[PDB]
Design a protein around this nucleic acid. Structure first.
Ligand code: ZN
Lengths: 317, 120, 53
RNA sequence: GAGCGCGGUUU
RNA sequence: GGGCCACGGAAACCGCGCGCGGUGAUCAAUGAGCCGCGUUCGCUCCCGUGGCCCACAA
């Protein structure tokens, strides 16, 4: 039941003396509702029917938003986890796209196969597969229930894997053929089926509760801080005196690191955080975790996408 | 039981309700399905709205009780949506049903409105 | 639609009782939504009363 | 413009 | 010169699909068939225009 996004990371400490100034920036739960939205992400439970694009278009018009983009597209008939980035957070979908998904599918067999044959044949698709051309990884398959020709199962996969195609190939391996009759995405990167997973009705109703009743609670819970979209990336945390420089397009040099994850290899996609766990930027590593740690000079991360506004932290340089 | 169900309806009361929709079908006039039922209420044609207690998702009918009160139309709960469909003369379920013109279940329905008057 | 989910355990199943927890299951997919939301006014009325607003 | 994420014709 | 940010790098029709309105069905009333109207977000490279910085973190 394990995806690579689940691996736990070790935090290596570079400057034990680094503290943060609480007068600077806005930690997620210190944000006025309007700022929360500007930098928010919805863990939407897409309903069957509409495309992912239409769904997002409705959200924009109904919440009166300028900009919004979803992560991995879900097909019209599919439901479940569709992450929707809003406003200034919109570009973080690029952090979500490569990450793995999990589905609960309902496969329908076109002929009769014993329950043990089924379970054993599906077991064999774990690992790499190739679909029509490219190669794709299946992290796990779990058969929950079989009711004659109906097979209900969970699957964890690499981004890009087509579940239709996969179920079709299982049909061929069993011989009788098969099609997918029902699909629901239950996880997409750091987004999962949890209390944050909100349907459209709940989402638009909460909006009115706030916009038309002065009730802020319910809609605030509907929106996650953009930081959520980055829970699965390796991180390096920076001293306050480097934060403003970096929102200004400066690369992150080694003297500005307070703390980082282990495991970072050159070329890796990393999230740059403040010591308050606000997200500053996305970047590509120029150094390994160990290199950043032992050095006293040099560029450790090329800063590529800046999310935090320039005026949250003072120009300390 | 679901939150859109706003009171408890005794077996006998809900049994009469199925007889009402029963008799209204072949001697009166009814509408079946939540869409026709909701049109009927918003056009003020509906005399009695019958709502099944086992609807999932709730949102399918959760709007019906508030709607009926707005329009001052009586509504009642029958236990099963399978048998509510059968009573309206279909082999498929019916989440909701409006009785438009009572027909022979004319008195039967005056009564049902009475008992629900109290239940509120 | 056939996929159902235990509200207690989170188990996905085709049955109306959780085979794990015993709870009654509900349909896994969310209800269809309309941009026009014809009855939003009334669904909200129901929902305020449910959330003690 | 070139890719990654609804099919067919028009300048 | 370099980096970051913003905007731009096409438009009109058809079909499919879906949504609404209408009608409301010989196991889809949690909505069939038919009719009319609607309807598909953005991301990444590069190019142009403009804005903010040039900051090894003190
Ligand atoms: Zn359990």
């Amino acid at each position: 039941r394990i995806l690579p996004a689940d691996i736990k990371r070790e935090v290596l400490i570079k400057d034990e003396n680094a503290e943060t100034n609480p007068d600077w920036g806005f930690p997620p739960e210190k944000r006025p509702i309007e700022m929360h939205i500007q930098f928010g992400v919805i863990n939407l439970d897409k309903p069957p029917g509409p495309t992912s694009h239409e769904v997002v278009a409705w959200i924009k018009k109904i919440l009166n938003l300028e900009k919004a983009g979803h992560g991995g597209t879900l097909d019209p008939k599919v439901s479940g986890v569709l992450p929707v980035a809003l406003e200034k957070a919109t570009r973080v979908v690029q952090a979500l796209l490569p990450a793995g998904k999990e589905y609960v599918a309902l496969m329908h067999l076109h002929g009769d196969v014993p329950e043990d044959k089924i379970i054993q044949v599906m077991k064999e698709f774990e690992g790499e597969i190739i679909q029509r051309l490219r190669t794709r990884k299946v992290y796990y398959i779990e058969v929950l229930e079989i009711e004659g020709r109906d097979v209900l199962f969970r699957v964890g996969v690499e981004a890009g894997t087509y579940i239709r195609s996969l179920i079709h190939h299982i049909g061929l391996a069993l011989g009788v053929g098969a099609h997918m009759s029902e699909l629901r995405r239950t996880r997409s990167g750091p987004f999962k089926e949890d209390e944050t997973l909100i349907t459209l009705h709940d989402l638009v109703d909460y909006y009115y509760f706030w916009k038309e009743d002065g009730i802020e609670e319910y809609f605030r819970k509907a929106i996650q801080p953009m930081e959520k979209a980055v829970e699965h990336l390796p991180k390096v945390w920076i001293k306050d005196s480097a934060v403003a420089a970096v929102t200004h397009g400066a690369d992150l040099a080694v003297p500005g690191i307070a703390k980082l994850h282990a495991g970072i290899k050159r070329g890796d996609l990393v999230a740059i955080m403040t010591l308050k766990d606000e997200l500053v930027a996305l970047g590509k590593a120029m150094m390994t975790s160990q290199e950043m740690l032992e050095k006293t000079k040099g560029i450790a991360v090329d800063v590529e996408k800046v999310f935090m506004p320039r005026d949250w932290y003072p120009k300390l340089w | 039981k679901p939150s859109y169900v706003k009171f408890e309806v005794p077996k006998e009361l809900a049994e009469k309700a199925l007889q009402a929709v029963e008799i209204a079908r072949d001697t009166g006039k009814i509408r079946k399905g939540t869409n026709e039922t909701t049109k009927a209420v918003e056009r003020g044609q509906a005399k009695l709205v019958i709502i099944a207690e086992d609807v999932d998702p709730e949102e399918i009918v959760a709007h019906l009780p508030p709607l009926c009160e707005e329009k001052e139309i009586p509504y009642i709960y029958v236990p099963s949506k399978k048998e509510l469909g059968a009573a309206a003369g279909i082999e498929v379920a019916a989440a909701s049903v409006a009785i438009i013109e009572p027909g022979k279940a004319r008195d039967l329905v005056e009564e049902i409105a009475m008992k629900v008057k109290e239940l509120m | 639609f056939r996929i159902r989910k235990c509200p207690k355990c989170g188990r996905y199943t085709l049955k109306e009782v959780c085979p794990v927890c015993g709870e009654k299951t509900k349909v896994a997919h969310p209800p269809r939504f309309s941009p026009e939301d014809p009855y939003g006014e009334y669904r909200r009325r129901w929902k305020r009363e449910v959330l003690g607003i």
